[PDB]
Structure formats: structure tokens, C-alpha cells
Amino acid sequence: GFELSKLLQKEHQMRKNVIKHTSARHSRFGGLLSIQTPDKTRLTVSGSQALVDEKIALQKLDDSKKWNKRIIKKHQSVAAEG
Amino acid sequence: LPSIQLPVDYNNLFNEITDFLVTFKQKGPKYMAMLQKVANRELNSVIIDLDDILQYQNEKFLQGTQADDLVSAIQQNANHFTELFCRAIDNNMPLPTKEIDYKDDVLDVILNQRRLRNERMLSD
Amino acid sequence: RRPQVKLTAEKLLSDKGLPYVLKNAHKRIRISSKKNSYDNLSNIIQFYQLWAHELFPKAKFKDFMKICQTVGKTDPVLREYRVSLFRDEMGM
DNA sequence: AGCAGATATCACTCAGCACGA
DNA sequence: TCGTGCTGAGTGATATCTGCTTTGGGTGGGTGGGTGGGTTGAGGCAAT
Description:
This is part of a larger assembly, with chains A, B and C. Chain A is about 45% helix and about 10% strand. Chain A has 4 helices and 2 strands. A two-stranded antiparallel sheet of chain A has the order 1-2. In chain A, strand 1 and strand 2 form a beta hairpin. The N and C termini of chain A lie far apart (about 40 Å). Chain B is extended. In chain B, about 60% of the residues lie in helices and about 0% in strands. Chain C contains 5 helices and no strands. The N and C termini of chain C lie far apart (about 50 Å). The chains are: A alpha+beta, B mainly alpha, C mainly alpha. Chains in contact: A-B, A-C. The structure holds a DNA duplex. It is classed as replication/dna. Keywords: cell division, translocation, replication.
């Protein structure tokens, strides 16, 4: 029981840290942000957290990107060597 | 898409429409005053009176500079003439006489920033 | 049959690139003793991420880093550039 | 016309070797 | 143990072609259902 309570508290802290990334209003509220680069060009982001925070805005900008660089992993089946 | 030779020249009709809008009188021109009112956000609807077009055609014929029958062309095919009249009005919209809050409108800001971005791209 | 976009040495050496970093990177970046370490790290990453985004939008940040690594290892012109930089600074 | 499944032809990564340093 | 190609076939990936089916209405049916819509008019039946 003591370990279960400690783990529940750990999960509670993790959820609390996660909460800052969630919007109080529903998804379809529809807030649009415009962020100004050092040069006079504006980028568009969506979400309340984007308007209220900047680090969240850049994280979303990053996250929204589609292109992924290939990662090749050298996997050896243990059953192959017996 | 085989072609046909119809007896209508839209360029001459557009010139007719522009001349009617600019010069027609019935003070200054009635439609010029209407466009001035529209520019100042005082009017949101412009109505073209076919009677005015007929009177203008009669006056032009009397003066000897006979012009195309615009009333019949409008009546026979009105969908195209709506766009033609809109283009003619746009090409001769007077500058506003009453200052307005341009920055309030979203479209004004968006188009201004598009112009800025285009200028930056061209400078590149 | 479509040419892919790559972070070529050409790109890196353009006006928007390494010369851009040298021209204006000390002004924007600032490591503060009165600020938290995480804040300073985030500020540095912020500057370099915006520069990267400007330069090469296709990739993410980390991906960008990796690409940079490979380019720098491979390209001989980039190497020259770097050496040039270093030399010119050592002469001051 | 639009959409979902599929074929096939397009590159890119780690792989490794010869020279010389 | 760095740099610069030359080789290389493997492991992708993304730019690129091959076949439904649909609206709704009986010019797909009642071995797809009637709680996915249509549907007002006539007809037969039981409780009244």
C-alpha cells in the first residue's frame, strides 16, 4: 500500500505537469496565434497555450512538422544464435 | 469546342458602361455620387436603373454618336453584365472623403501584411 | 524523379546561414547568472531553432543537428570555411 | 470526381576497402 | 586513427497508377433492415 501510494503520487505529479499543455475550453474554441520572427515575418499557430506561452508555440511549431529523418537500428534476433 | 461569331463586342459594352457611370447626369453625376457614398461606408447597395441607361442611349443617339444598345444586351444576358458593372465600378471608385479606422478591419491588415511579404520576397 | 531538398554546403554558406549566425548571435543569445540554467538552455535553443527554421524549414531541430553533423563531417568547402573563420579569429 | 489500395521505380544509410598520414 | 572517394545491396519512401461507388429511388433488391430515410390513402380488423 505504501508503494502504491507513492506511485500514485508520482503519477499525480506527472499529470499535473501534463495539465499545462491542455486547454480549458474544448477543441473547437478556435484561437489563432501569429508569432513574429526576428525578421518581419509572421507564423501561424493554433491553440490557447500558443497564445498564452511562447515555448509552447515553438514546441508546437516543431511538432507539426511532417518530415522525419530515417533511423536504422541493427537488430539481431536472439533465437538466431540459439 | 467549336466557335461561333456573335454580334456582341464586350469591350465596346464595357466602354459604354464606364462612360454611362462617369458622365450620366439626371449637380454632379448621380452614380458618381452613389459611389462616393459607398466609399465612405454610407451605402452598401447600388441599383442600376435601366431607365437611366435608355435615356443615356437616346441622348447619345441624338448627339450623333450612336452607341450600342446596352439595355437590350443587359436584358438578354444579365449575369455577365453584373460582373461587368462591378468591374467598371471598381475601376472608378473615388477615394474616401471621410477618414475611417482601416486598422480595425481584419482584411485590411491581412492584405497589408501580404503586401509586406510580397515586397520582402521581391527584394530577395 | 523529384530532386530532394538537402542542407548542402551551399546553403550553409549563404547570406542566411553561418554568416548570419556570426553577424547576430551574441546580441540575441544571453546567458544570465541571475536566470535558471534551464532558462538559459531554452534561450540558446530558441535562437538556434528560429535560425534553423528560417534556413531549412523541412527538418525539426534535432534532425537539423544531426544533418549538420553529417554535413560538417563530409563537405570539404564547409571545412574550408570553418578553418577560415578560426584562422581569421586567431589572427586578431 | 473523389478516395483507398497497390505497384514499382526513386534515393539514401550503413557498410568496408584502398592510399597516406 | 581522419579524409575521400569507389562499391553496394540493402532498406527503405514517396512519387506514382488501378478499381470502386456514390446520389438516393425502385432503370440494385426483400437471404442488407424497419430505430438510416421515404409516408399519404385505402383497406381490413378489433374494441367500442
